[PDB]
């Protein structure tokens, strides 16, 4: 069968990732993170779509600088994986 | 008498003027409001929509299509040094990020 | 209550920029949402440099300096000239 | 459990929109811890603009001033 | 017109804290810079709270919503507390 | 008539509700100004300053000086963590930084 | 007078540096804060003399500078 | 010619510098240079000795953060030394 090398399926998810806007996180799975984290603050608390919406849309872009900023460190300490102290560095530079 | 010559066509600008007076007045940011002061800001205004307009209609234009879509106001954004870091910490929905790689990561 | 809008405001600005280029109604949404960021941070800046030196009025120089703060650049000084303009033409 | 709604393809295309090629396998727990705590803060703000209203249903409006109130204006809304 | 300063009320209250202890007038601008500082930032979120509700008038529970809001964890509720103490004690 | 009582009594507070409502009403944040409001920030003002003078007072105890100093107020304010995300963006003049050493960096 | 980045030198870089907690510090990192040193002094500076010429003055007061320093975000007390 | 290892100075100066408040740029050089930089700006302009001050205490607050947050990189990077890559990293990661 026909394989791959490791990189260019990641190169080409990049390409079609960046050039277009769609939603990648689901809306259910998203929205009921929501409502769980609401639920201890406020019992009983509803929330129309378009929230739901707006929420996901500041999360998701917050993440992917997030994940930018996570990639730069990498590539600053030379390492092409992104660790998860790639990531504590990157919001303690932000102040998180 | 006379017909009515209104403000923003007085000053030959798009923008209204009266909308901003009234906004700045209802908004209680001062005791009193000058007279040039909406006329400036709705000047400002508009310049800074045609200048992201043109932006984002050019590159609806580098998109092959002539309907301006908020990636296309994005990448506007974010292209242009001075819009990027003027709306460094705005976050624009259905506009994704710029198209780049970083040199490693290419093969 | 009712909700003010600026799609036929910005919709003849790009018709003025480009007259034959469209805009959807999120790119509506989003343009007039950074109106509004804009006009809130600009009266912002404009109020407290009017507080700053114990005045209760805001004129067109609250506006410039606003822009000067804000804008940077080239950007604010294209703001600047149109203003001046569009003040100039005014009287 | 909606925390581990959330499904790890969905972070690996969140990094892939953030230009990242590969993706260590013990982040994908750092991210969505890091992703709850941003949650709750914007969650937690838009929840006290909400009984300030003396309103039961979270509209996207107050979130919006939520995020703008944080450095994190959102567009659009 | 006068100037505002905090200058005795900080005094009061590090005596009702700190009887033994003093204060330098670096640290006396720095206290009242740090007053006057959180009173613009709770009252600026009071009057933009006041304004998103379509409201005229800045009351206790926009105050209250904007200690919850800049204020983070503990403090937030200790504030709303010690406002809620206070309110009750102009009450009666 | 009855001898008049300030507000420091009247709240069971120090800081000034009257000058409180001074500002808030000559600083232009709305049209009107509730009763309460004033009370309520002396109150979270009179809070946070008595939290933040505790703070300074144990950490001049720990450092043995009878006098507030400017570096005890950064070291109190940095030390809380509330105060540490409270006042995060905020430069403290004569304050200098906490003294922590990386592990690695100590032999 | 011109040519005065070279008035922050290498032993006060190496002070603040040490303030930071540094134990090593580049010979190259001089000319590199330097020049952050400067970009965000010509910012406030910016921000400082467009609050000045807004108010008819001259001189440029602290109360401003202050004022510039928390418009960015960084606020200073103490002043 | 007893010597002291070149490591242990580094940070007996970082407990000096970190304990005590003394400013680390002189006033004089700090303030030709706020002169020189004004001097584009404005022809003819005044600095008061306070405002002078407070910009020198602002100056050094954000150099000191700065190279704070460009050591947690080189800790990052397994690295001890700070390079002029570590800050462009800090500086591109808050969008400076």
């Not at chain 1, 406020?42 to 996901?56: E, G, I, N, P, Y």
């Given at each position: 069968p026909?394989?791959?090398?490791?990189?260019?399926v990641?190169?080409?998810?990049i390409?079609?990732?960046?050039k277009?806007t769609?939603?990648?996180?689901?809306?259910?799975?998203?929205?009921?993170?929501?409502?769980?984290?609401?639920?201890?603050?406020?019992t009983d608390?509803?929330?129309?779509?378009?929230?739901?919406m707006?929420?996901?849309?500041?999360?998701?872009?917050?993440?992917?600088?997030?994940?930018?900023?996570t990639?730069?460190?990498?590539?600053?300490?030379?390492?092409?994986?992104?660790?998860?102290?790639?990531?504590?560095?990157a919001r303690?530079?932000?102040?998180? | 008498?006379?017909?009515?010559?209104?403000?923003?066509?007085?000053?030959?600008?798009?923008?209204?003027?009266?909308?901003?007076?009234?906004?700045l007045?209802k908004?209680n940011?001062?005791?009193?409001?000058?007279?040039?002061?909406?006329?400036?800001?709705?000047?400002?205004?508009?310049?800074?929509?045609?200048?992201?307009?043109?932006?984002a209609?050019?590159?609806?234009?580098?998109?092959?299509?002539?309907?301006?879509?908020?990636?296309?106001?994005?990448?506007?954004?974010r292209?242009?040094?001075?819009?990027?870091?003027?709306?460094?910490?705005?976050?624009?929905?259905?506009?994704?990020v710029?198209?780049?790689?970083?040199?490693?990561?290419?093969? | 209550?009712?909700?003010?809008?600026?799609?036929?405001?910005?919709?003849?600005?790009?018709?003025?920029?480009?007259?034959?280029?469209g805009?959807?109604?999120?790119?509506?949404?989003?343009?007039?949402?950074?109106v509004?960021?804009?006009?809130?941070?600009?009266?912002?800046?404009?109020?407290?440099?009017?507080?700053?030196?114990?005045?209760?009025?805001?004129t067109?120089?609250?506006?410039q300096?606003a822009?000067?703060?804000?804008?940077?650049?080239?950007?604010?000084?294209?703001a600047?000239?149109?203003?001046?303009?569009?003040?100039?033409?005014?009287? | 459990?909606?925390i581990?709604?959330?499904?790890?393809?969905?972070?690996?295309?969140?990094?892939?929109?953030?230009?990242?090629?590969?993706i260590?396998?013990?982040?994908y727990?750092?991210?969505?811890?890091?992703?709850?705590?941003?949650?709750?803060?914007?969650?937690?703000?838009?929840?006290?603009?909400?009984?300030?209203?003396?309103?039961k249903?979270?509209?996207?409006?107050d979130?919006?001033?939520?995020?703008?109130?944080?450095?994190?204006?959102?567009?659009?809304?």
């Amino acid at each position: 069968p026909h394989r791959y090398r490791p990189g260019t399926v990641a190169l080409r998810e990049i390409r079609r990732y960046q050039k277009s806007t769609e939603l990648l996180i689901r809306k259910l799975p998203f929205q009921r993170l929501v409502r769980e984290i609401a639920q201890d603050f406020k019992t009983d608390l509803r929330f129309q779509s378009s929230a739901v919406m707006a929420l996901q849309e500041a999360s998701e872009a917050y993440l992917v600088a997030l994940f930018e900023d996570t990639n730069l460190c990498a590539i600053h300490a030379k390492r092409v994986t992104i660790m998860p102290k790639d990531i504590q560095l990157a919001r303690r530079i932000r102040g998180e | 008498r006379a017909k009515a010559k209104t403000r923003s066509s007085r000053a030959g600008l798009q923008f209204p003027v009266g909308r901003v007076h009234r906004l700045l007045r209802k908004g209680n940011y001062a005791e009193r409001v000058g007279a040039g002061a909406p006329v400036y800001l709705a000047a400002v205004l508009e310049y800074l929509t045609a200048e992201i307009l043109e932006l984002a209609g050019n590159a609806a234009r580098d998109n092959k299509k002539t309907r301006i879509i908020p990636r296309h106001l994005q990448l506007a954004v974010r292209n242009d040094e001075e819009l990027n870091k003027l709306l460094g910490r705005v976050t624009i929905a259905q506009g994704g990020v710029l198209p780049n790689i970083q040199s490693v990561l290419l093969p | 209550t009712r909700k003010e809008s600026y799609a036929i405001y910005v919709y003849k600005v790009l018709k003025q920029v480009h007259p034959d280029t469209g805009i959807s109604s999120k790119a509506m949404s989003i343009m007039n949402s950074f109106v509004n960021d804009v006009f809130e941070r600009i009266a912002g800046e404009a109020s407290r440099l009017a507080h700053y030196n114990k005045r209760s009025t805001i004129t067109s120089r609250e506006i410039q300096t606003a822009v000067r703060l804000l804008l940077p650049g080239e950007l604010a000084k294209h703001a600047v000239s149109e203003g001046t303009k569009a003040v100039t033409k005014y009287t | 459990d909606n925390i581990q709604g959330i499904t790890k393809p969905a972070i690996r295309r969140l990094a892939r929109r953030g230009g990242v090629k590969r993706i260590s396998g013990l982040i994908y727990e750092e991210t969505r811890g890091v992703l709850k705590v941003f949650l709750e803060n914007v969650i937690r703000d838009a929840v006290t603009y909400t009984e300030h209203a003396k309103r039961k249903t979270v509209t996207a409006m107050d979130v919006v001033y939520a995020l703008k109130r944080q450095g994190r204006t959102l567009y659009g809304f």
